[PDB]
Amino acid sequence: GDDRELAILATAENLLEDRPLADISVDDLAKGAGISRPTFYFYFPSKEAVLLTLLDRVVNQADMALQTLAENPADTDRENMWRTGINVFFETFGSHKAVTRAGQAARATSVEVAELWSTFMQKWIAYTAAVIDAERDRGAAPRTLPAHELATALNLMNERTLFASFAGEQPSVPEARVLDTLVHIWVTSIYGEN
Amino acid sequence: GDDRELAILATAENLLEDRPLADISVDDLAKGAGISRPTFYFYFPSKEAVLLTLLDRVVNQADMALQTLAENPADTDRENMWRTGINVFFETFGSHKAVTRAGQAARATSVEVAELWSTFMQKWIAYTAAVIDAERDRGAAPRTLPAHELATALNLMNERTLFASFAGEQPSVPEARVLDTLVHIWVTSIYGEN
Numbered sequence: 001g002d003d004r005e006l007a008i009l010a011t012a013e014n015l016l017e018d019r020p021l022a023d024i025s026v027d028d029l030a031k032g033a034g035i036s037r038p039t040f041y042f043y044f045p046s047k048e049a050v051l052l053t054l055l056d057r058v059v060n061q062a063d064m065a066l067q068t069l070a071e072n073p074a075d076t077d078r079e080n081m082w083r084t085g086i087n088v089f090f091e092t093f094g095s096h097k098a099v100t101r102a103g104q105a106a107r108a109t110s111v112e113v114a115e116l117w118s119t120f121m122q123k124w125i126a127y128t129a130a131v132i133d134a135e136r137d138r139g140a141a142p143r144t145l146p147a148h149e150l151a152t153a154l155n156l157m158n159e160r161t162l163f164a165s166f167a168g169e170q171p172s173v174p175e176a177r178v179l180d181t182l183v184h185i186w187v188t189s190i191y192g193e194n
Numbered sequence: 195g196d197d198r199e200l201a202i203l204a205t206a207e208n209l210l211e212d213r214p215l216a217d218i219s220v221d222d223l224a225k226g227a228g229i230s231r232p233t234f235y236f237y238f239p240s241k242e243a244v245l246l247t248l249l250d251r252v253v254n255q256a257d258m259a260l261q262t263l264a265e266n267p268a269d270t271d272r273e274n275m276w277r278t279g280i281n282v283f284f285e286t287f288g289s290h291k292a293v294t295r296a297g298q299a300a301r302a303t304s305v306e307v308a309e310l311w312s313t314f315m316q317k318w319i320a321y322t323a324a325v326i327d328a329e330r331d332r333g334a335a336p337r338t339l340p341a342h343e344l345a346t347a348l349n350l351m352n353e354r355t356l357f358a359s360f361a362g363e364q365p366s367v368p369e370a371r372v373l374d375t376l377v378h379i380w381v382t383s384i385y386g387e388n
């Protein structure tokens with residue numbers, strides 16, 4: 001009943017390693033999962049619904065992980081604080097590169113995928129702006145740009161930059177350099193007077 | 195002979211305002227251009243080839259404009275220097291939002307579009323890193339991150355952020371705030387010790 005769904009999901013992720021969604025069929029997924037094609041159709045209406053679910057799981061896993069840090073006041077400098085937070089996304093999405101690649105491409109063809117991404121991007125930006133605001137309150141960061149606007153561009157940077165790196169796009173920041181790169185830009189733009 | 199091509203190009207850009215490429219037909223474009231369908235096929239092999247050409251023109255227009263500034267040593271502060279350069283892209287792409295939207299989406303389905311974008315992104319990053327290097331040489335900017343890595347992430351920020359704004363994505367930085375936002379992050383990350 002339920003392993004069947006989980007077997008579909010694993011097969012989908014497995015097969016996403018080697019080819020896009022357009023090159024994987026319901027037969028491909030039923031076959032991998034040890035089920036017939038109409039039995040697939042009991043768990044999912046389409047291969048696109050399988051992707052949506054994979055992406056949902058990865059996005060939520062990154063969100064929950066971020067909330068774990070949000071509840072814990074880890075004794076450290078400002079720089080370490082942002083690094084560990086950026087690291088949540090580096091590690092989560094980086095541990096699921098195929099789903100991330102596929103999920104990003106699916107934004108353009110699927111309003112459910114587009115909505116999903118939009119929802120969590122809104123949450124992550126709001127939390128970032130909440131933290132920049134706290135920093136400003138305590139006199140740790142200067143009152144420069146509107147915090148929500150600053151938080152938007154920085155999170156958009158992280159999206160584009162982390163994902164370009166994972167896919168090895170030309171141009172991209174090498175995966176082994178991306179964390180350091182993003183953290184530099186975050187700290188100097190949040191804390192910098194100029 | 196040649197206005198016919200230019201009429202196809204104008205009709206394509208006109209029609210891109212109201213719907214995507216998938217909702218515009220060769221008949222749509224021949225019709226707008228005052229030509230028959232087989233006469234279209236003399237100038238372009240596909241609607242996708244019409245897009246590629248539109249994008250090529252917009253990318254080159256932004257590149258030439260950037261090179262005009264690159265040759266001129268405009269007397270001003272560091273902040274103004276980057277602002278006018280970022281402005282080249284804000285203005286060019288912002289004056290051609292439909293082609294930009296369509297051209298960005300076409301990256302995913304067209305290796306010629308993907309290659310085109312990749313080529314110019316490589317050029318623009320190289321020039322940015324060349325300027326950061328000059329700044330460092332003259333003692334204007336500190337030797338923090340590798341310049342080419344810094345330049346990559348900043349240009350990726352500009353890509354994602356400017357384009358999200360133009361399309362009015364949720365989340366996005368309002369178009370009237372995006373220039374100020376990007377310039378802040380560029381100046382603090384290039385010039386900031388921390």
Ligand SMILES: CC(C)(C)OC(=O)N1CCC(c2nc(-c3cccs3)no2)CC1
Binds near residue numbers: 081083125128
């Ligand atoms: C200070 C704490 C740990 C609370 O927050 C952070 O350090 N953050 C908040 C969220 C930031 C974030 N990055 C991202 C994305 C990366 C890639 C695509 S979205 N989404 O949110 C990373 C830094």
Ligand SMILES: CC(C)(C)OC(=O)N1CCC(c2nc(-c3cccs3)no2)CC1
Binds near residue numbers: 276278280283356
């Ligand atoms: C200092 C000079 C004027 C030489 O350069 C700049 O100010 N630049 C270099 C190029 C930078 C750039 N932005 C972009 C993109 C914006 C949107 C998509 S690419 N490409 O290159 C903008 C700032």
